[PDB]
Design a protein around this nucleic acid. Sequence first.
DNA 1: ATCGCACCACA
DNA 2: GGTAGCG
Length: 271
Amino acid sequence: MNRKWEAKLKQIEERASPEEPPSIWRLFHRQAQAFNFVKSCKEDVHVFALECKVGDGQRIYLVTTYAEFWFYYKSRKNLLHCYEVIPENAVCKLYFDLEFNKPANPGADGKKMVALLIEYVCKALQELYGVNCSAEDVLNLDSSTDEKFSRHLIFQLHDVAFKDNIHVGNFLRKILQPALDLLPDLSFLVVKNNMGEKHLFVDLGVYTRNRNFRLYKSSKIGKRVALEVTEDNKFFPIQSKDVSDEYQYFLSSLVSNVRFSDTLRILTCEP
DNA sequence: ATCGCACCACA
DNA sequence: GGTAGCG
Ligand SMILES: Nc1ncnc2c1ncn2[C@H]1C[C@H](O)[C@@H](COP(=O)(O)OP(=O)(O)OP(=O)(O)O)O1
Ligand SMILES: [Ca+2]
């Protein structure tokens, strides 16, 4: 309700300022106008944010289908620097943004940090929710450079999803509370930043309303490194004669792309 | 013309 | 509260 109030008050602030093939492809200046269009649309359409030429993090918002988006995106000629918008209150996969500064952390073995993180999360999902999974259900995406160990993990739980990304965040700050206290041996998550201050390997700042999350094969606009399937990745989509593996990987990586299932379990976690 | 949320603060 | 620095 509070969220409903501030969101509409921002829109009040903004008010103060020969058949062709079926294709939906609309751009908007305000992310709220994009969602207005989505609700009005009646086709399974989703919101993307495109970083426009700048150093700025300014975005325009694109509205289309996953299938049509991929069609114009997959060559990586255009639509560089693209972001998934994780809609508030939509069911979503459990995901992670993991990063640490490599010079500031000469001892850290990032590969083992993800493997031990995944194991603890899988134990947490079993103990708290009865969900059984393993690293074979984790899509491992890498955007690392020589300065930064950067990885995105997207869990592919069978017939399971979280109520929305706020609840993913509540679930994570609950199970990571021992780690947040070093600020059952979760010390392997603590890392130094540039200024020597210890933080977590797990970035807790991405579980926010309408969080932008950088697409598979997109780079930040300043940069050249794009998210790509990590070498050690152990999640493999079932192969299909009807879709390319790369499209399979794309759809798995979309946090809001919850597999339509008739037996779906929805996980909640309250603060 | 993006968006939506730790560290200080006063009292 | 009260914001600006962050993601
Ligand atoms: N200025 C911004 N405006 C809107 N959304 C943002 C902004 N900065 C970051 N985000 C969103 C998109 C990012 O994918 C997500 C995680 O932040 P961040 O770690 O800085 O980027 P990243 O994980 O995609 O790349 P990196 O490899 O640099 O860590 O938060
Ligand atoms: Ca990151």
